Amino acid sequence: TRDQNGTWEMESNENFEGYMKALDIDFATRKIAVRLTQTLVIDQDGDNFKFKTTSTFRNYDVDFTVGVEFDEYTKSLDNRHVKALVTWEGDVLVCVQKGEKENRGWKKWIEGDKLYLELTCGDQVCRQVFKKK
Amino acid sequence: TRDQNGTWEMESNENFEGYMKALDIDFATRKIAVRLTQTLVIDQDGDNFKFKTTSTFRNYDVDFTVGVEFDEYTKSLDNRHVKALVTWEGDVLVCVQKGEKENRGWKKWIEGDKLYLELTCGDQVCRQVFKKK
DSSP states (O other), rough: OOOOOOEEEEEESSSHHHHHHTTTOOOHHHHHTTTEEEEEEEEEETEEEEEEEEEEEEOOEEEEETOOOEEEEEEETTOOOOEEEEEETTEEEEEEEEEESSTTTTEEEEEEEEEEEEEEEETTEEEEEEEEO | OOOOEEEEEEEEEHHHHHHHHTTTTTTHHHHHHTTOEEEEEEETTTTTTEEEEEEEOOOOOEETTTTOEHHHHTTEEEEEEEEEEEEEEEEEEEEESSSSSTTOOOEEETTTTEEEEEEETTTTTEEEEEOOO
């Protein structure tokens, strides 16, 4: 069958490291790329192809209870150990990540249909906005 | 509202570069991480939270017609210019990527409900298998 239409979800990827190395892809890209999974959407009409490709990485779960301090290794990030405490301030979910970094934590809250997340470390603030699906 | 349940799809991400830099994340990780979009699935029961996070990157489209040579800049990979020719060999879709790299190309075919992709460059072969969704 020459009909390759569909959404295709990568189940295995063998020797992507060697292929990328043969293409002179640099070390630090290869270390990340080998952890990705790819989804391939093929829209084919006769001999006309459109290929659409998204690469995905599942991050480490986080489970916690508000008010119960917990140990967190930030493996998706800087891979440091912190002691996280999540509390409510009104409807704002507030987390302090005690550890090497000063003023490290985050705040999470809903407004309308958007979820706001503010990450802080040192004098830096990163503001993320999410839409509900 | 303290109910943060849902699937949440990142719409914006401001100063992730500075936050990651404050965490001493290395240059080449930061260059990739700033191109990601995150999807956050929150399962919340009272004050028990489970956070599940997937990071996604949309790659460059590829549109072609079998038998019609086309120019391809491999921006998702090594960012080289190749002249790609895609032909059928039976039900196997065969692509030669003429350019600097010797023996560069790929083969794509279906078997059952799986799509097989073999990437080649030099003496290296990378074998990918996809499941239909």
